[PDB]
Structure formats: C-alpha cells, structure tokens
C-alpha cells in the first residue's frame, strides 16, 4: 500500500474598532463530511475554532 496526501486551508477573520478600545471576535463552525452509506449510517465531524 502507498499513498500521497496533500491538503491546504486558508482562513481569515476581519473586524474593526475605534482606536484605544478593545474588541473580541471568535468563531467555530462544524464541518461535516459524507461517510459512504445511508442505511448503514454514521457521521464524522470536526469543529474549527478561532478567537
């Protein structure tokens, strides 16, 4: 068995304030993917957090 794996991910938050004032941004989506089978049923998922 042999294989070659390659993956990229590029993400960016944007936010604005005034000057000399704090601000918070945070975010977390959950990305699902389709495991093969509908009656033979299962899922798998990864949360992707940012702050």
């Amino acid at each position: 068995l042999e294989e070659k794996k390659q993956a990229t991910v590029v993400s960016r938050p944007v936010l604005l304030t005034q000057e000399n004032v704090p601000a918070i941004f945070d975010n977390n989506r959950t990305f699902y993917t389709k495991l093969i089978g509908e009656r033979n049923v299962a899922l798998e998922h990864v949360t992707y957090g940012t702050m």
């Binding site: 068995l1 389709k34 093969i36």
Partner: protein, 51 residues
Amino acid sequence: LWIVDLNKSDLERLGTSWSGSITIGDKLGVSLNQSSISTLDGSRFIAAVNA
C-alpha cells in the same frame, strides 16, 4: 444588521481497496492486508469499490 451566509462544497470518491487471503495445500497461507488466518481458511480474497 444583516446576517448573511454562503456555503458551497463538493466531494468525490472513487476507487477500490482490496483484502483477503488464499491457501496452498494446507502447507502455506498467504494473506493480504491484515486478514488473519485464525478466522478464515478457505474464504478467498474480496474487494470493495466506492463510488
């Protein structure tokens, strides 16, 4: 204020992956990919395709 979301995803899956074992004269046993002979003696090698 205006919430707005856009989502877009596509995914493809194709190919096979093999496993199983053979036997020769009750003298030698060749197995492919972790198929233990301690559970199988005459069950010949199988495949699995996903599309």
